[PDB]
C-alpha cells in the first residue's frame, strides 16, 4: 500500500480474497475426493470390462 | 411394443420412405420417431438396421421443408446425442457406400445445425426465452472463445438476465446453466471478474453451490472455479 488507508484497502482485499481462495480450495479438494470415489466405486469393473 | 429385428428394419424402411417425401417428412413430426430410434440404435448394431436408420436420418435433415423443420429434427438428434454416435460410426467403416456417405452427410448437417444453435443471436434468444437447457451453444467451446465478449452487449444485458435468473429460476436446470454460463463468462473474458462481482454473480454462484439440487451445486462449483481460475 501507499498510505494507511491503502493498507486498509489492501488488507480487506487480501483478507476477502484469501478467504475466498481457502473456501474454494477446500471445496475443490473435497470435490476431487468426491469424484475420485465416484470413479473408484466401479473402476475395477471398468478395468476388467 | 418391442417387435422383432426384421420388423424393425421394415418399419424403419417405411419411415425412410416417408422421410424421402418432403411433405410426408413434414407430416411425420407429429410422432417424432427420432427419440425412439436414437436409443434403439444402441442395441440394433446389425448392418441392416443401422444403415436404414442412418438413411432415414439423412432423409429427415435433407427433405425437411423449412430451416425451422431442419432445426427441429437436428435439435431432437443432438439433445438425444446422435452426434457422438455419428462420430463413432465415422471412425467405423462398413461394406457399402450408403452407410458411410450418410454418416458423413449427417456429420456435415449436424455440425451446421450445431453452429447455427451456437449463433450469438441464438444465445441471446435462448436467454430471453428461458431455454437454458444445454443447447450446443452452451458446451461449444469455440463459440465461447469467439463470443464471450458478446455478453457485454447492450450494457451486459445477457449477464443481467443470467444474474436475475440466478434468483428467479425455479427450474434447477435453468439455475445451474445460469451459474455455469456466468462462470464461463469470467473464464473467457478476464475483465468480467469485476462485472460479475458488481452483478452479484460471484456471491450467487458461491452460494448456489449450496443449492438444494446437487446438479445446481455442481454447476455453481464449476462456475466459482472459473472465477477462481486466477486472481
mmCIF file of C-alpha atoms in Angstrom:
data_model
loop_
_atom_site.group_PDB
_atom_site.id
_atom_site.type_symbol
_atom_site.label_atom_id
_atom_site.label_comp_id
_atom_site.label_asym_id
_atom_site.label_seq_id
_atom_site.Cartn_x
_atom_site.Cartn_y
_atom_site.Cartn_z
ATOM 1 C CA UNK A 1 0.000 0.000 0.000
ATOM 2 C CA UNK A 2 0.899 3.659 -0.438
ATOM 3 C CA UNK A 3 -0.817 5.114 2.659
ATOM 4 C CA UNK A 4 -2.512 3.690 5.782
ATOM 5 C CA UNK A 5 -5.874 3.972 4.025
ATOM 6 C CA UNK A 6 -4.386 1.951 1.176
ATOM 7 C CA UNK A 7 -3.181 -0.530 3.796
ATOM 8 C CA UNK A 8 -6.769 -0.888 4.974
ATOM 9 C CA UNK A 9 -7.923 -1.282 1.367
ATOM 10 C CA UNK A 10 -5.312 -3.923 0.565
ATOM 11 C CA UNK A 11 -5.769 -5.713 3.898
ATOM 12 C CA UNK A 12 -9.520 -6.026 3.388
ATOM 13 C CA UNK A 13 -8.973 -7.088 -0.215
ATOM 14 C CA UNK A 14 -6.424 -9.773 0.634
ATOM 15 C CA UNK A 15 -8.460 -10.970 3.615
ATOM 16 C CA UNK A 16 -11.505 -11.391 1.392
ATOM 17 C CA UNK A 17 -9.523 -12.943 -1.457
ATOM 18 C CA UNK A 18 -7.553 -15.423 0.661
ATOM 19 C CA UNK A 19 -10.781 -16.369 2.444
ATOM 20 C CA UNK A 20 -12.405 -16.993 -0.941
ATOM 21 C CA UNK A 21 -9.383 -18.968 -2.115
ATOM 22 C CA UNK A 22 -9.413 -21.064 1.067
ATOM 23 C CA UNK A 23 -13.135 -21.736 0.618
ATOM 24 C CA UNK A 24 -12.773 -22.826 -2.998
ATOM 25 C CA UNK A 25 -9.595 -24.777 -2.159
ATOM 26 C CA UNK A 26 -11.375 -26.825 0.497
ATOM 27 C CA UNK A 27 -14.336 -27.201 -1.839
ATOM 28 C CA UNK A 28 -12.200 -28.288 -4.807
ATOM 29 C CA UNK A 29 -10.189 -30.798 -2.780
ATOM 30 C CA UNK A 30 -13.402 -32.276 -1.378
ATOM 31 C CA UNK A 31 -14.689 -32.312 -4.970
ATOM 32 C CA UNK A 32 -11.630 -34.297 -6.054
ATOM 33 C CA UNK A 33 -12.311 -36.711 -3.208
ATOM 34 C CA UNK A 34 -15.951 -36.981 -4.280
ATOM 35 C CA UNK A 35 -15.329 -37.537 -7.996
ATOM 36 C CA UNK A 36 -12.396 -39.896 -7.379
ATOM 37 C CA UNK A 37 -14.543 -42.061 -5.100
ATOM 38 C CA UNK A 38 -17.363 -41.912 -7.652
ATOM 39 C CA UNK A 39 -14.993 -43.388 -10.223
ATOM 40 C CA UNK A 40 -13.431 -45.847 -7.761
ATOM 41 C CA UNK A 41 -16.868 -47.221 -6.880
ATOM 42 C CA UNK A 42 -16.812 -49.169 -10.173
ATOM 43 C CA UNK A 43 -13.360 -48.604 -11.686
ATOM 44 C CA UNK A 44 -12.170 -52.175 -11.147
ATOM 45 C CA UNK A 45 -15.149 -53.386 -13.158
ATOM 46 C CA UNK A 46 -14.249 -50.640 -15.634
ATOM 47 C CA UNK A 47 -10.731 -52.064 -15.809
ATOM 48 C CA UNK A 48 -11.826 -55.636 -16.411
ATOM 49 C CA UNK A 49 -14.503 -54.566 -18.888
ATOM 50 C CA UNK B 1 -44.137 -52.807 -28.345
ATOM 51 C CA UNK B 2 -40.700 -54.433 -28.927
ATOM 52 C CA UNK B 3 -41.280 -56.103 -32.276
ATOM 53 C CA UNK B 4 -38.669 -58.333 -33.878
ATOM 54 C CA UNK B 5 -35.475 -57.316 -35.639
ATOM 55 C CA UNK B 6 -36.708 -57.848 -39.206
ATOM 56 C CA UNK B 7 -39.869 -55.922 -38.354
ATOM 57 C CA UNK B 8 -37.742 -53.048 -37.012
ATOM 58 C CA UNK B 9 -35.878 -52.927 -40.304
ATOM 59 C CA UNK B 10 -39.185 -52.956 -42.191
ATOM 60 C CA UNK B 11 -40.789 -50.103 -40.260
ATOM 61 C CA UNK B 12 -37.620 -48.015 -40.446
ATOM 62 C CA UNK B 13 -37.825 -48.749 -44.173
ATOM 63 C CA UNK B 14 -41.337 -47.297 -44.112
ATOM 64 C CA UNK B 15 -40.349 -44.176 -42.159
ATOM 65 C CA UNK B 16 -37.374 -43.778 -44.505
ATOM 66 C CA UNK B 17 -39.818 -43.856 -47.419
ATOM 67 C CA UNK B 18 -41.946 -41.206 -45.684
ATOM 68 C CA UNK B 19 -38.882 -39.051 -44.996
ATOM 69 C CA UNK B 20 -37.938 -39.264 -48.668
ATOM 70 C CA UNK B 21 -41.007 -37.151 -49.454
ATOM 71 C CA UNK B 22 -40.767 -33.500 -48.317
ATOM 72 C CA UNK B 23 -44.407 -33.236 -47.250
ATOM 73 C CA UNK B 24 -44.562 -36.677 -45.621
ATOM 74 C CA UNK B 25 -41.346 -35.835 -43.783
ATOM 75 C CA UNK B 26 -43.095 -32.671 -42.608
ATOM 76 C CA UNK B 27 -46.143 -34.726 -41.609
ATOM 77 C CA UNK B 28 -44.433 -37.379 -39.514
ATOM 78 C CA UNK B 29 -43.041 -34.931 -36.930
ATOM 79 C CA UNK B 30 -46.393 -35.379 -35.168
ATOM 80 C CA UNK B 31 -44.852 -38.666 -33.956
ATOM 81 C CA UNK B 32 -41.138 -37.770 -33.654
ATOM 82 C CA UNK B 33 -39.616 -41.230 -34.190
ATOM 83 C CA UNK B 34 -36.088 -39.939 -33.518
ATOM 84 C CA UNK B 35 -36.162 -40.215 -29.695
ATOM 85 C CA UNK B 36 -37.058 -43.894 -30.082
ATOM 86 C CA UNK B 37 -34.682 -44.562 -32.973
ATOM 87 C CA UNK B 38 -31.636 -42.910 -31.385
ATOM 88 C CA UNK B 39 -31.570 -45.201 -28.355
ATOM 89 C CA UNK B 40 -32.808 -48.289 -30.222
ATOM 90 C CA UNK B 41 -29.806 -47.842 -32.497
ATOM 91 C CA UNK B 42 -27.663 -48.707 -29.463
ATOM 92 C CA UNK B 43 -28.989 -52.272 -29.472
ATOM 93 C CA UNK B 44 -29.578 -52.667 -33.238
ATOM 94 C CA UNK B 45 -25.907 -52.865 -34.180
ATOM 95 C CA UNK B 46 -26.824 -55.029 -37.182
ATOM 96 C CA UNK B 47 -25.783 -53.543 -40.515
ATOM 97 C CA UNK B 48 -29.346 -53.691 -41.886
ATOM 98 C CA UNK B 49 -30.981 -51.632 -39.144
ATOM 99 C CA UNK B 50 -28.057 -49.257 -38.596
ATOM 100 C CA UNK B 51 -27.882 -48.481 -42.321
ATOM 101 C CA UNK B 52 -31.608 -47.897 -42.653
ATOM 102 C CA UNK B 53 -31.785 -45.629 -39.584
ATOM 103 C CA UNK B 54 -28.845 -43.605 -40.906
ATOM 104 C CA UNK B 55 -30.635 -43.270 -44.241
ATOM 105 C CA UNK B 56 -33.832 -42.146 -42.504
ATOM 106 C CA UNK B 57 -31.807 -39.561 -40.566
ATOM 107 C CA UNK B 58 -30.321 -38.191 -43.781
ATOM 108 C CA UNK B 59 -33.800 -38.111 -45.295
ATOM 109 C CA UNK B 60 -35.169 -36.110 -42.363
ATOM 110 C CA UNK B 61 -32.424 -33.498 -42.495
ATOM 111 C CA UNK B 62 -32.476 -33.358 -46.314
ATOM 112 C CA UNK B 63 -36.193 -33.204 -47.099
ATOM 113 C CA UNK B 64 -37.189 -31.085 -44.103
ATOM 114 C CA UNK B 65 -39.163 -28.296 -45.760
ATOM 115 C CA UNK B 66 -38.050 -25.317 -43.636
ATOM 116 C CA UNK B 67 -34.983 -24.124 -41.778
ATOM 117 C CA UNK B 68 -37.113 -24.446 -38.642
ATOM 118 C CA UNK B 69 -38.014 -28.019 -39.630
ATOM 119 C CA UNK B 70 -34.329 -28.875 -40.022
ATOM 120 C CA UNK B 71 -33.688 -27.227 -36.655
ATOM 121 C CA UNK B 72 -36.453 -29.260 -35.000
ATOM 122 C CA UNK B 73 -35.125 -32.564 -36.343
ATOM 123 C CA UNK B 74 -31.495 -31.685 -35.638
ATOM 124 C CA UNK B 75 -32.336 -30.490 -32.116
ATOM 125 C CA UNK B 76 -34.042 -33.797 -31.403
ATOM 126 C CA UNK B 77 -30.931 -35.523 -32.721
ATOM 127 C CA UNK B 78 -28.372 -33.538 -30.728
ATOM 128 C CA UNK B 79 -30.324 -33.455 -27.471
ATOM 129 C CA UNK B 80 -30.585 -37.247 -27.842
ATOM 130 C CA UNK B 81 -26.830 -37.380 -28.563
ATOM 131 C CA UNK B 82 -26.752 -38.516 -32.204
ATOM 132 C CA UNK B 83 -23.608 -36.502 -32.959
ATOM 133 C CA UNK B 84 -21.240 -38.583 -30.821
ATOM 134 C CA UNK B 85 -22.735 -41.744 -32.318
ATOM 135 C CA UNK B 86 -22.151 -40.353 -35.813
ATOM 136 C CA UNK B 87 -18.520 -39.647 -34.902
ATOM 137 C CA UNK B 88 -18.139 -43.212 -33.608
ATOM 138 C CA UNK B 89 -19.702 -44.647 -36.769
ATOM 139 C CA UNK B 90 -17.439 -42.416 -38.876
ATOM 140 C CA UNK B 91 -14.478 -43.957 -37.075
ATOM 141 C CA UNK B 92 -16.179 -47.220 -38.029
ATOM 142 C CA UNK B 93 -16.123 -48.496 -41.616
ATOM 143 C CA UNK B 94 -18.686 -50.616 -43.451
ATOM 144 C CA UNK B 95 -19.408 -52.701 -46.540
ATOM 145 C CA UNK B 96 -21.115 -50.301 -48.947
ATOM 146 C CA UNK B 97 -21.203 -46.623 -49.841
ATOM 147 C CA UNK B 98 -24.538 -45.664 -48.321
ATOM 148 C CA UNK B 99 -23.704 -46.161 -44.628
ATOM 149 C CA UNK B 100 -20.516 -44.085 -44.666
ATOM 150 C CA UNK B 101 -21.736 -41.470 -47.145
ATOM 151 C CA UNK B 102 -24.824 -40.960 -44.962
ATOM 152 C CA UNK B 103 -22.731 -40.739 -41.789
ATOM 153 C CA UNK B 104 -20.561 -38.095 -43.458
ATOM 154 C CA UNK B 105 -23.593 -36.136 -44.676
ATOM 155 C CA UNK B 106 -25.139 -36.322 -41.212
ATOM 156 C CA UNK B 107 -21.919 -35.098 -39.625
ATOM 157 C CA UNK B 108 -21.933 -32.160 -42.048
ATOM 158 C CA UNK B 109 -25.552 -31.235 -41.366
ATOM 159 C CA UNK B 110 -25.424 -31.800 -37.603
ATOM 160 C CA UNK B 111 -22.284 -29.666 -37.463
ATOM 161 C CA UNK B 112 -24.046 -26.915 -39.388
ATOM 162 C CA UNK B 113 -27.006 -27.143 -37.002
ATOM 163 C CA UNK B 114 -24.652 -27.010 -34.011
ATOM 164 C CA UNK B 115 -23.033 -23.873 -35.419
ATOM 165 C CA UNK B 116 -26.469 -22.342 -36.007
ATOM 166 C CA UNK B 117 -27.540 -23.062 -32.422
ATOM 167 C CA UNK B 118 -24.161 -21.620 -31.376
ATOM 168 C CA UNK B 119 -25.014 -18.389 -33.198
ATOM 169 C CA UNK B 120 -24.689 -15.367 -30.924
ATOM 170 C CA UNK B 121 -28.264 -14.418 -31.799
ATOM 171 C CA UNK B 122 -29.402 -17.861 -30.706
ATOM 172 C CA UNK B 123 -27.581 -17.473 -27.396
ATOM 173 C CA UNK B 124 -29.293 -14.146 -26.725
ATOM 174 C CA UNK B 125 -32.656 -15.547 -27.822
ATOM 175 C CA UNK B 126 -32.442 -18.591 -25.537
ATOM 176 C CA UNK B 127 -31.511 -16.260 -22.688
ATOM 177 C CA UNK B 128 -34.616 -14.206 -23.491
ATOM 178 C CA UNK B 129 -36.786 -17.338 -23.869
ATOM 179 C CA UNK B 130 -35.561 -19.082 -20.714
ATOM 180 C CA UNK B 131 -34.226 -22.041 -22.703
ATOM 181 C CA UNK B 132 -31.102 -22.573 -20.581
ATOM 182 C CA UNK B 133 -31.336 -26.311 -21.206
ATOM 183 C CA UNK B 134 -27.991 -27.474 -22.634
ATOM 184 C CA UNK B 135 -28.275 -26.379 -26.243
ATOM 185 C CA UNK B 136 -24.978 -27.000 -28.094
ATOM 186 C CA UNK B 137 -24.072 -23.311 -27.764
ATOM 187 C CA UNK B 138 -23.535 -23.897 -24.048
ATOM 188 C CA UNK B 139 -20.826 -26.555 -24.478
ATOM 189 C CA UNK B 140 -19.336 -25.426 -27.816
ATOM 190 C CA UNK B 141 -16.019 -24.069 -26.554
ATOM 191 C CA UNK B 142 -15.223 -22.329 -29.848
ATOM 192 C CA UNK B 143 -18.428 -20.308 -29.542
ATOM 193 C CA UNK B 144 -17.430 -19.226 -26.046
ATOM 194 C CA UNK B 145 -13.983 -18.154 -27.231
ATOM 195 C CA UNK B 146 -15.482 -16.223 -30.149
ATOM 196 C CA UNK B 147 -18.448 -14.592 -28.411
ATOM 197 C CA UNK B 148 -17.701 -14.300 -24.678
ATOM 198 C CA UNK B 149 -17.393 -10.565 -25.373
ATOM 199 C CA UNK B 150 -20.958 -10.651 -26.714
ATOM 200 C CA UNK B 151 -22.199 -10.965 -23.130
ATOM 201 C CA UNK B 152 -21.131 -7.322 -22.683
ATOM 202 C CA UNK B 153 -23.502 -6.193 -25.440
ATOM 203 C CA UNK B 154 -26.497 -3.981 -24.672
ATOM 204 C CA UNK B 155 -24.687 -2.961 -21.480
ATOM 205 C CA UNK B 156 -24.291 -6.511 -20.173
ATOM 206 C CA UNK B 157 -27.965 -7.390 -20.637
ATOM 207 C CA UNK B 158 -27.042 -11.058 -21.152
ATOM 208 C CA UNK B 159 -25.196 -11.222 -17.831
ATOM 209 C CA UNK B 160 -28.086 -9.307 -16.259
ATOM 210 C CA UNK B 161 -30.526 -11.953 -17.495
ATOM 211 C CA UNK B 162 -28.241 -14.654 -16.110
ATOM 212 C CA UNK B 163 -27.896 -12.964 -12.712
ATOM 213 C CA UNK B 164 -31.637 -12.331 -12.451
ATOM 214 C CA UNK B 165 -32.291 -15.982 -13.291
ATOM 215 C CA UNK B 166 -29.826 -16.932 -10.557
ATOM 216 C CA UNK B 167 -32.511 -15.754 -8.097
ATOM 217 C CA UNK B 168 -35.622 -16.199 -10.291
ATOM 218 C CA UNK B 169 -35.134 -19.686 -11.815
ATOM 219 C CA UNK B 170 -37.468 -22.245 -10.286
ATOM 220 C CA UNK B 171 -36.076 -24.832 -12.701
ATOM 221 C CA UNK B 172 -32.823 -26.319 -11.326
ATOM 222 C CA UNK B 173 -31.622 -26.876 -14.895
ATOM 223 C CA UNK B 174 -32.015 -23.178 -15.681
ATOM 224 C CA UNK B 175 -30.379 -22.162 -12.395
ATOM 225 C CA UNK B 176 -27.399 -24.462 -12.943
ATOM 226 C CA UNK B 177 -26.944 -23.331 -16.539
ATOM 227 C CA UNK B 178 -27.096 -19.696 -15.438
ATOM 228 C CA UNK B 179 -24.376 -20.235 -12.836
ATOM 229 C CA UNK B 180 -22.248 -22.219 -15.293
ATOM 230 C CA UNK B 181 -22.581 -19.593 -18.028
ATOM 231 C CA UNK B 182 -21.709 -16.856 -15.528
ATOM 232 C CA UNK B 183 -18.537 -18.764 -14.690
ATOM 233 C CA UNK B 184 -17.742 -19.361 -18.359
ATOM 234 C CA UNK B 185 -18.014 -15.621 -18.988
ATOM 235 C CA UNK B 186 -15.255 -14.948 -16.458
ATOM 236 C CA UNK B 187 -13.224 -17.832 -17.887
ATOM 237 C CA UNK B 188 -13.407 -16.450 -21.424
ATOM 238 C CA UNK B 189 -13.273 -12.687 -20.695
ATOM 239 C CA UNK B 190 -10.816 -11.579 -17.979
ATOM 240 C CA UNK B 191 -12.399 -8.195 -17.213
ATOM 241 C CA UNK B 192 -15.664 -9.984 -16.441
ATOM 242 C CA UNK B 193 -14.392 -10.727 -12.934
ATOM 243 C CA UNK B 194 -15.353 -7.270 -11.691
ATOM 244 C CA UNK B 195 -18.541 -7.284 -13.791
ATOM 245 C CA UNK B 196 -19.659 -10.482 -12.051
ATOM 246 C CA UNK B 197 -18.677 -9.069 -8.660
ATOM 247 C CA UNK B 198 -20.782 -5.990 -9.468
ATOM 248 C CA UNK B 199 -23.791 -8.016 -10.644
ATOM 249 C CA UNK B 200 -23.540 -10.403 -7.689
ATOM 250 C CA UNK B 201 -22.915 -13.499 -9.798
ATOM 251 C CA UNK B 202 -19.854 -14.132 -7.637
ATOM 252 C CA UNK B 203 -21.933 -14.314 -4.464
ATOM 253 C CA UNK B 204 -24.851 -16.002 -6.203
ATOM 254 C CA UNK B 205 -22.804 -18.926 -7.531
ATOM 255 C CA UNK B 206 -20.642 -19.239 -4.412
ATOM 256 C CA UNK B 207 -23.935 -19.580 -2.529
ATOM 257 C CA UNK B 208 -25.792 -21.774 -5.039
ATOM 258 C CA UNK B 209 -23.007 -24.295 -4.669
ATOM 259 C CA UNK B 210 -25.158 -24.905 -1.572
ATOM 260 C CA UNK B 211 -28.377 -25.056 -3.613
ATOM 261 C CA UNK B 212 -30.911 -27.769 -2.826
ATOM 262 C CA UNK B 213 -30.237 -29.626 -6.110
ATOM 263 C CA UNK B 214 -26.868 -31.343 -6.452
ATOM 264 C CA UNK B 215 -26.832 -30.507 -10.161
ATOM 265 C CA UNK B 216 -27.101 -26.794 -9.345
ATOM 266 C CA UNK B 217 -24.473 -27.224 -6.619
ATOM 267 C CA UNK B 218 -22.110 -28.911 -9.088
ATOM 268 C CA UNK B 219 -22.552 -26.300 -11.817
ATOM 269 C CA UNK B 220 -22.136 -23.497 -9.274
ATOM 270 C CA UNK B 221 -18.898 -25.078 -8.061
ATOM 271 C CA UNK B 222 -17.731 -25.206 -11.676
ATOM 272 C CA UNK B 223 -18.609 -21.521 -12.086
ATOM 273 C CA UNK B 224 -16.818 -20.492 -8.887
ATOM 274 C CA UNK B 225 -13.787 -22.456 -10.099
ATOM 275 C CA UNK B 226 -13.964 -20.402 -13.297
ATOM 276 C CA UNK B 227 -13.985 -17.203 -11.232
ATOM 277 C CA UNK B 228 -11.003 -18.526 -9.260
ATOM 278 C CA UNK B 229 -9.130 -19.609 -12.407
ATOM 279 C CA UNK B 230 -6.652 -16.957 -11.229
ATOM 280 C CA UNK B 231 -6.560 -13.780 -9.113
#
